[PDB]
């Protein structure tokens, strides 16, 4: 249609693209988080939905991952993936096969979050943070990840309205 773009919002590539009912953004099935259900009546992307949504951090993390919490984490993970640095931290870290708290990567967090494998917000946020902690303790990589981390931590505060 004339009201939707022809590049996936996340990876800027063509192929099988699903249109958001409201905005111009389009997505590959698995590029959107959670995955696109074209079944739906209609399909709206998570940005347009979260736009229409209506305190200490300790509180937020302790929260059980109920339908709203689950959506907000999915919202945060989609923003992480939309950052150009997501490429680097998507798969197994480079360092992993070279002769450090737990190997972590975005595709691992993505599978877990889509599978409802985090009982609390804390599980998601801690895995996300571990990616950067593990990174820091290695090698010669400049500011790689600085933007991905900073962006997540800004969005995390904003989405759960953490203290100023």
């Amino acid at each position, epitope marked *: 249609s004339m009201r939707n773009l022809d590049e996936c919002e996340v990876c800027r590539d063509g192929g099988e693209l699903f249109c958001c009912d*409201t905005c111009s953004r389009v997505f590959h099935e698995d590029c959107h988080i959670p995955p696109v259900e074209a079944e739906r009546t209609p399909w*709206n992307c998570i940005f347009c939905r*979260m736009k229409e949504s*209506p305190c200490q951090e300790s509180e937020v993390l302790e929260r059980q991952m109920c*339908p709203e919490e689950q959506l907000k984490c999915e919202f945060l993970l989609l923003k992480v993936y939309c950052c150009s640095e997501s490429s680097f931290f998507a798969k197994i870290p480079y360092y992993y096969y070279i002769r450090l708290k737990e190997p972590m990567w975005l595709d691992k967090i993505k599978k877990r979050l889509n599978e409802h494998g985090y009982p609390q917000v804390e599980g998601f946020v801690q895995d996300m943070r571990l990616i950067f902690q593990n990174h820091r303790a290695s090698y010669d990589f400049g500011q790689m990840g600085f933007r991905l981390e900073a962006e997540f931590e800004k969005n995390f505060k904003e989405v759960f309205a953490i203290q100023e």
Partner: single-chain antibody
Amino acid sequence: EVQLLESGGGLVQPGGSLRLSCAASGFTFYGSGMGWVRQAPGKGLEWVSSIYSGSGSTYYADSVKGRFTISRDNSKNTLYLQMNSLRAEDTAVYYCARTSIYYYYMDYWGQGTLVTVSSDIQMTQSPSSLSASVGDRVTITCRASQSISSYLNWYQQKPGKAPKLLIYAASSLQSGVPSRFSGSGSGTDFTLTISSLQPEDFATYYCQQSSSLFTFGQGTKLEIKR
């Protein structure tokens, strides 16, 4: 501040046509999904049609397919329902309702306008009818034909009033609703629970799936004991 006012309801000969309009104010009209829900006198709620972003995103009940046409003019903040080939089945109060796309629930309802004539997801609601006392713990339940994830809403309706949203996203308490109300469940089986029943809680309660179109439960009348 938010107001939905329906008009265009009235008397029609069978087979004839009628056009319902709903004037919206107090919210960004194009940012919101808009639905029509009817209710026959004494009967439960039935989703008719909802429109989202333009004519490409229109949905109808099998009942009214190829017979009713929903439309919107965002420039005039108006929702329309064209009604053709009208039966007696169609005689009902037609509510204008705003569907928030956050988790696909109807948080704002008009007064309703009355029209007088001369393989979807089913929602079973146990019990049909309940007698309880002030202070008692009440648990109404909804079951779904197939899985509807957490896209499940709970509504209260009282005599002479429009439905009111209690719960959205299966277990989220709508702003203003007292804390004694709570929802639970996901997949097929769901539960509305009132911890300590209050005089004002005597009403009819409908559940509603949002997963694919909308389908309402049969309703559950909660009445006082002797």
